[PDB]
């Protein structure tokens, strides 16, 4: 549940961090490109960015 996974993990996010903001619209190529770097694949990529930005919103309260 946890999930949680966490998960998230890693290393990636770290890199995604800076990257996220920069652009937040990763293209197809952009990802694959970054994937080549190491260890990151389209998968977690999107999953990341996606969920990553979700945290942004928010507002949320927004809640």
UniProtKB/Swiss-Prot annotation:
Subcellular location: Cytoplasm; Nucleus
DNA-binding feature ranges: 1-60
Tissue: Isoform 3 is B-cell specific. Isoform 5 is expressed in B-cells and the immunoglobulin-expressing T-cell line MOLT-4, but not in the T-cell line BW5147.
The family this protein is said to belong to: Belongs to the POU transcription factor family. Class-2 subfamily.
Quaternary structure and partners: Interacts with NR3C1, AR and PGR. Interacts with POU2AF1; the interaction increases POU2F2 transactivation activity.
Stated role: Transcription factor that specifically binds to the octamer motif (5'-ATTTGCAT-3'). Regulates IL6 expression in B cells with POU2AF1. Regulates transcription in a number of tissues in addition to activating immunoglobulin gene expression. Modulates transcription transactivation by NR3C1, AR and PGR.
Protein name as annotated: POU domain, class 2, transcription factor 2
Species lineage: Eukaryota, Metazoa, Chordata, Craniata, Vertebrata
Whole sequence portion shown: 297 to 359 of 479
